[PDB]
Design a binder for this molecule. Structure first.
Ligand SMILES: NC(=O)c1ccc[n+]([C@@H]2O[C@H](COP(=O)([O-])OP(=O)(O)OC[C@H]3O[C@@H](n4cnc5c(N)ncnc54)[C@H](O)[C@@H]3O)[C@@H](O)[C@H]2O)c1
Ligand SMILES: NCCC[C@@H](N)C(=O)NCCC[C@H](N)C(=O)O
Ligand SMILES: [Mg+2]
Ligand code: NA
Length: 258
């Protein structure tokens, strides 16, 4: 579904904790990961955030959180007073170089200076898949991808391009076939589980990661909401959790259009 205000409470602490976890797992902070993916770094580019009333409308804490996220990664960001088209105009007129705005189906970053444009879905799948894959103590190039939709598919695509051995599952058999037929990934059978130390999950569902596939100290990299693994299992296998509701995906978008 959609983000709620409650998901975005204390976004600064959520981002701090996510950054620490990415550092622990991969040896790089989120800036470092983006640098590896896109070769870019921030130089205080001016970023206009435009609230949008379309569909379900303005989500409490959404623009405020993007404002914090952008500032956190060193951008010169602002949120427009007006929403929608009037907000867009305001943003361009106040000198935005990059526009950031979302409706219920599309969240984008558009860099007006160089024409590059990012969609949040593939940009999130890519960065979370990248983070998972750079797990320093992995000891294997096998990775399990659970969820092969708009976030998951591009994530798996990235891992295949990066020369990882990708096993894929989606509860929707048509989506699983599309992935094996277009990407050439290996289909994972829940009934014949093997342990993974690298796991990437991209679903809107809880408890999608069976106990049988967790190895001790494995990384679980998931944009998904709610959380893919119960607290109990996460504690029991000392699982290294990378999960954060907006900022890591947002960083991936911004750095990709620089
Ligand atoms: N943290 C972030 O910044 C961020 C950014 C974008 C999206 N998301 C979240 O990521 C999640 C997925 O996004 P999406 O757009 O790819 O959704 P999607 O609907 O395009 O794909 C989700 C897939 O998960 C599959 N699925 C559901 N239950 C499953 C199960 N038990 N086992 C295996 N697969 C299962 C579905 O069949 C579906 O194909 C959503 O919760 C979304 O809110 C988070
Ligand atoms: N990436 C796909 C998942 C859903 C996405 N399009 C979204 O979060 N919409 C957010 C809507 C923001 C709202 N219009 C606002 O400006 O507050
Ligand atoms: Mg995120
Ligand atoms: Na989930």
């Amino acid at each position: 579904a959609l983000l709620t205000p409650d998901d975005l409470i204390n976004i600064n602490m959520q981002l701090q904790k996510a950054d620490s976890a990415v550092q622990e797992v991969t040896g790089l902070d989120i800036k470092g990961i983006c640098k590896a993916l896109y070769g870019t770094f921030s130089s205080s580019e001016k970023v206009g955030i435009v609230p949008v009333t379309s569909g379900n409308g303005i989500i409490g804490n959404f623009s405020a959180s993007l404002h914090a996220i952008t500032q956190y990664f060193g951008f010169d960001s602002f949120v427009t007073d007006m929403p929608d088209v009037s907000g867009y105009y305001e943003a361009v007129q106040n000198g935005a170089e990059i526009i950031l705005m979302a409706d219920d189906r599309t969240f984008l970053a558009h860099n007006l200076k160089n024409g590059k444009m990012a969609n949040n879905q593939p940009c999130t799948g890519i960065i979370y898949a990248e983070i998972a894959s750079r797990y320093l103590k992995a000891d294997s190039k096998d990775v399990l991808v659970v969820g092969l939709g708009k976030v998951g598919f591009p994530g798996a695509e990235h891992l295949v391009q990066k020369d990882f051995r990708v096993y894929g599952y989606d509860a929707d058999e048509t989506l699983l076939e599309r992935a094996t037929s277009n990407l050439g990934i290996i289909p994972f059978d829940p009934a014949n589980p093997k342990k993974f130390s690298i796991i990437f999950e991209a679903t809107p569902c809880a408890n999608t990661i069976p106990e049988a596939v967790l190895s001790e100290n494995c990384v679980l990299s998931t944009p998904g909401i709610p959380c893919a693994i119960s607290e109990e299992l996460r504690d029991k296998y000392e699982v290294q959790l990378i999960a954060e509701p907006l900022g890591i995906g947002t960083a991936s978008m911004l750095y990709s259009v620089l």
